[PDB]
Amino acid sequence: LFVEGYKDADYWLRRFEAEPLPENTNRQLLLQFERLVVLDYIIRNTDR
Amino acid sequence: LFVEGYKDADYWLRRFEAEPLPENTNRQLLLQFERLVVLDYIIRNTDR
Amino acid sequence: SWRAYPFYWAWLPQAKVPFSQEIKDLILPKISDPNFVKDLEEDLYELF
């Protein structure tokens, strides 16, 4: 299924390095990042 | 009033650099830190 | 080689932050339950 208005992870990642996120947003982003880790690690993704 | 079990902010601050803090705890440190900023800015501390 | 197919997100600063509670609470009950893993193997076999 197609999902709208996303961008390359590093596009934002770089933009956050410049002007950081309000801590609440950033806590959120980190919650998601951990889900990605678990997912990529279980299926031992070779290409992330 | 004397307060117990504290350490120089920079002592902890540099340890946190070596070991990052769990994001929930870190969100807490940040709320405290904002309060410091507010206090020090209003009284315009000369010596922080 | 361990080098050969890295997870690129591991170089990110966010990868240094310890895992949350939210995530241990979501995952640990599941993947530590020998029944849940066997369902997952089963369901993957069914797809593959």
Ligand SMILES: Nc1ncnc2c1ncn2[C@@H]1O[C@H](COP(=O)(O)OP(=O)(O)O)[C@@H](O)[C@H]1O
């Ligand atoms: N489910 C999706 N929703 C929105 N955009 C997507 C989705 N899947 C892929 N894209 C976008 O389309 C491009 C090509 O997708 P994909 O084929 O998955 O990557 P690659 O080009 O590396 O094979 C990607 O750069 C991505 O931004």
